Amino acid sequence: RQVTIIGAGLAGTLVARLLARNGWQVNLFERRPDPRIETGARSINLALAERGAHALRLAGLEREVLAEAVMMRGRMVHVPGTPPNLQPYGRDDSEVIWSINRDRLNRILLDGAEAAGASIHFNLGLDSVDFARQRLTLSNVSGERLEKRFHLLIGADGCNSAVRQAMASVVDLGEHLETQPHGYKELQITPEASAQFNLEPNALHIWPHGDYMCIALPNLDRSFTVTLFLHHQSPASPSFAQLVDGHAARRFFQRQFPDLSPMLDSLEQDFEHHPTGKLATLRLTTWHVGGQAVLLGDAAHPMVPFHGQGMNCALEDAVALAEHLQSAADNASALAAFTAQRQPDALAIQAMALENYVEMSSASPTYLLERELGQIMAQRQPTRFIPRYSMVTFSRLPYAQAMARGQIQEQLLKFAVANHSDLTSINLDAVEHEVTRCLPPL
Ligand SMILES: Cc1cc2nc3c(=O)[nH]c(=O)nc-3n(C[C@H](O)[C@H](O)[C@H](O)COP(=O)(O)OP(=O)(O)OC[C@H]3O[C@@H](n4cnc5c(N)ncnc54)[C@H](O)[C@@H]3O)c2cc1C
Ligand SMILES: Cc1cc2c(c(C)c1Cl)N(CC(=O)O)C(=O)CO2
Ligand SMILES: [Cl-]
Numbered sequence: 001r002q003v004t005i006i007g008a009g010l011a012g013t014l015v016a017r018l019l020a021r022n023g024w025q026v027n028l029f030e031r032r033p034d035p036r037i038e039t040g041a042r043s044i045n046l047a048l049a050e051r052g053a054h055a056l057r058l059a060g061l062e063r064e065v066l067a068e069a070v071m072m073r074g075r076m077v078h079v080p081g082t083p084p085n086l087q088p089y090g091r092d093d094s095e096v097i098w099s100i101n102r103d104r105l106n107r108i109l110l111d112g113a114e115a116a117g118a119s120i121h122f123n124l125g126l127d128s129v130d131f132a133r134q135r136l137t138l139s140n141v142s143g144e145r146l147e148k149r150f151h152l153l154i155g156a157d158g159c160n161s162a163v164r165q166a167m168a169s170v171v172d173l174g175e176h177l178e179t180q181p182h183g184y185k186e187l188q189i190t191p192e193a194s195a196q197f198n199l200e201p202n203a204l205h206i207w208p209h210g211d212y213m214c215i216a217l218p219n220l221d222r223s224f225t226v227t228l229f230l231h232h233q234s235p236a237s238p239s240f241a242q243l244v245d246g247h248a249a250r251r252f253f254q255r256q257f258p259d260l261s262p263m264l265d266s267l268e269q270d271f272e273h274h275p276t277g278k279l280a281t282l283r284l285t286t287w288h289v290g291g292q293a294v295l296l297g298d299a300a301h302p303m304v305p306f307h308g309q310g311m312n313c314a315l316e317d318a319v320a321l322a323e324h325l326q327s328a329a330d331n332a333s334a335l336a337a338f339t340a341q342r343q344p345d346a347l348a349i350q351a352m353a354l355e356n357y358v359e360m361s362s363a364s365p366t367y368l369l370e371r372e373l374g375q376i377m378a379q380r381q382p383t384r385f386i387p388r389y390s391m392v393t394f395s396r397l398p399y400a401q402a403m404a405r406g407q408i409q410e411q412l413l414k415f416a417v418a419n420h421s422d423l424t425s426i427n428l429d430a431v432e433h434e435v436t437r438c439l440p441p442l
Contacts, residue, residue, distance in 0.1 A: 001025070003325075004136075004150040006126045006163050008032075011297035011314040012156030013109035016118040017059055018322035026118035029138060031125030036107050044186065045217040045225045046105070047072065047204065047308040048098040049393045055315035061112050065105060069098035070218045076203040080259050086203060095394050097308075099204075099217045126157065129166035131292060136166075152331055153293040154321070159280075161299035167289050174285025180304055182212075182229045183240050183276045191222040193263045199224065207257055208361035212238060214257060226264065232276075246271040279304050281350055287339040291332030294339075296321055301346040306360065307353040307392065316396075317342055348399040352392060370413040372423055373431065377413075380432050383441040385409060397442075408438055 001024050005012050008030035020026045048069060056062040073096050074088040090096060114120060124138040127145065136153070139145045155163025168175060189199070199205065205216040205224070212230040219225065231239040238256070243249045246268030253261040261267070282302040288294040297314035321338050328334030377385040388406035391397050397405075416431045 001152075003027075003152045003154060004029070004148070005154040005156055007155070007157035007161075007299070008110060008113075008120055008122075009106065009156060009158060009297070010109065010311050011318045012154070013106065013113050014055065014059060014315055015154065015156065015296070015318040015322050016113040016120075017061075017109070017116045018318065019325065020113065020116035020118040022322070022326055026113075028113065028118055028120045029124050029126065030120065030122045032122065034110070034120075034122045035103055036110060043188065043219070043223075043225055044102040045099050045219065046102055046311050047217065048100050049308070049312050051309070051396060052312035052315040053098070054396060055319045058319060059112065061108060064108050065100060066098060068104050068220060069100045070220060071202050072097050072099055072204045072218070073202050074204070076200055076205045078205065078207045078259065084200070084205075086200070090390065090394060095390065097204075097393065099219070101219065126162045126166075129153065129163065129293070131166075131170050131289065134292070152291070152325075155293065155295040155299045156297055157299050159282075159298040159302045161295065163293060164284075164295055164299055167293055167295070171286070171289050173287075174283075176283050178281040178283070180279035180281065181231050181233070182279055183232045184230075184279065185228045185240075185271060185276055186274050187226040187228065187264055187270045188266060189216065189224040189226060189263050190265060193265060194218075194222050194224055197263055199263070206360070207260055209256060210361050212256075213361055214260060226260075240276055243271070281354065283347065283350065284343070287343060288335035291330060291335060294321065294335045296342075301343075301350060303346075303350045303353045304357065305353070306357040307349070309349055309353065309392065313346065313349055313399075317346075345399040348403045349392070352388070352399070352403060366417060369417045369420070369422065370410075373416055373426065373428075374409070374413055376423075376428060377431065377435055380428075381435050381439075384439040385435055386442070405439065412438065 003019060003024055003026055005016055005026065005028045008028050012028060016026050016028050048065070053062055056065055072089070073093065074086050077085045077087060110120065123140050127137045127139050129136045134151070135147050135149055137145055137147055153163065155161050157163055164173070167173060201218045201222055207214040212228070214226055214228050216224040216226045231237065233239050233241050238252060243252060249271040250261070250267055253264065253267060280302055281304060284300060287300050296317040298310065300317070303310055320342055324334040324338045325331070328337065374385065374387070378387065386405070388402060388409070391402035391405065392399070412431070412434055416426060420426050
């Protein structure tokens with residue numbers, strides 16, 4: 001059985017390995033050059049959690065990826081003047097996540113696909129698809145075009161997928177775009193600076209500031225990659241529109257992030273040389289065209305990054321697609337069932353990612369008592385009352401079920417605290433009863 005995959009990023013390389021391993025004839029096309037060919041040219045990080053780690057585990061690559069990953073035990077919150085505060089992510093060191101360099105991951109996955117027998121072809125970008133004739137057109141940076149025949153086409157070509165554009169002209173995909181008002185910019189902290197300011201290596205760092213914020217993830221050599229999230233446009237308010245050059249960015253950091261600015265030795269140059277990125281949420285009602293083509297990963301469901309689950313979801317998609325294709329009656333059956341299974345879960349993580357943004361800078365007295373009570377209920381009923389962050393991050397429960405269980409827990413906590421000043425007035429034994437009455441064990 002034959003397949004053509006567009007995009008050798010994270011989902012495309014993983015599905016290529018899983019199908020080649022099963023004896024499929026796989027051809028993978030990528031517009032960038034091969035990153036494994038060392039050049040004289042001169043650092044993006046991601047958070048790997050259980051969903052992505054489990055996908056790599058099935059592919060037999062987890063140990064190689066984790067050997068180059070830095071453990072993050074929790075969230076380190078910075079407010080000027082005050083000492084940083086560590087919020088642990090899990091119950092113990094079994095529940096942690098991992099900072100992995102994006103380029104390192106992609107190189108490991110590329111080697112793994114070739115080892116399984118897939119053929120990879122770089123410097124070729126997909127331009128268009130002719131579905132009636134089963135041919136597609138690719139081009140190099142020098143504009144020269146060539147044509148190829150295909151039997152099955154997998155769009156793994158990212159948030160700006162050309163496969164999706166071609167599909168949307170022969171079927172109605174129910175596309176809807178929800179634009180995000182924030183852009184982002186990447187900046188660097190050196191190993192020297194991070195040591196000098198005693199920045200904890202085994203944590204994710206965040207500088208909240210309401211409508212804008214900064215995060216930082218660690219690297220193996222003790223450097224950190226910093227990401228600024230800030231509105232493109234002002235309604236007045238700060239925004240990328242007012243930051244005309246690196247010197248303006250420096251003044252903004254010294255005023256709004258005064259304890260982070262001294263760590264950013266190359267702020268001015270990074271700001272002017274790295275491009276400002278865009279964010280969005282894009283939802284589709286269907287991900288396939290008959291038995292001829294299918295989408296996965298960011299090509300199917302771009303999401304805002306505030307839960308750190310886009311790569312984790314894409315790798316989970318790749319496992320599912322390979323399973324459906326291996327055992328279905330025919331490609332058309334496989335693609336319809338893949339869409340039916342994954343699209344409701346992709347929709348749910350898209351919604352939870354947006355909610356995490358508000359959840360994190362955007363403080364309440366009710367919220368405090370609710371969280372005090374939820375910890376008690378998780379200690380008394382560890383099998384039933386499980387924080388939604390844990391369900392999303394450390395389990396493989398379908399996203400839609402994680403969201404539903406999270407909703408029941410929030411309603412129980414709301415009614416339990418309503419019109420109570422503090423825990424002294426609440427009948428904990430009675431709350432525990434409702435927990436058992438409404439939440440089945442897992
Ligand atoms: C700022 C930021 C932070 C994030 N942090 C996290 C995090 O902590 N954890 C997490 O899990 N996710 C995170 N994500 C999301 C994650 O990066 C993506 O969801 C993930 O990379 C999607 O993988 P993919 O294989 O579907 O797409 P990609 O990784 O983008 O791969 C697409 C590939 O297709 C190629 N391509 C594109 N167009 C064509 C074409 N026409 N022809 C041929 N090839 C083409 C591209 O060059 C690329 O190689 C973050 C995203 C952003 C923007
Ligand atoms: C880009 C990014 C990646 C993430 C997280 C966040 C905020 C961001 Cl902005 N988080 C969420 C959290 O701490 O609630 C994680 O867990 C780890 O992946
Ligand atoms: Cl993400």
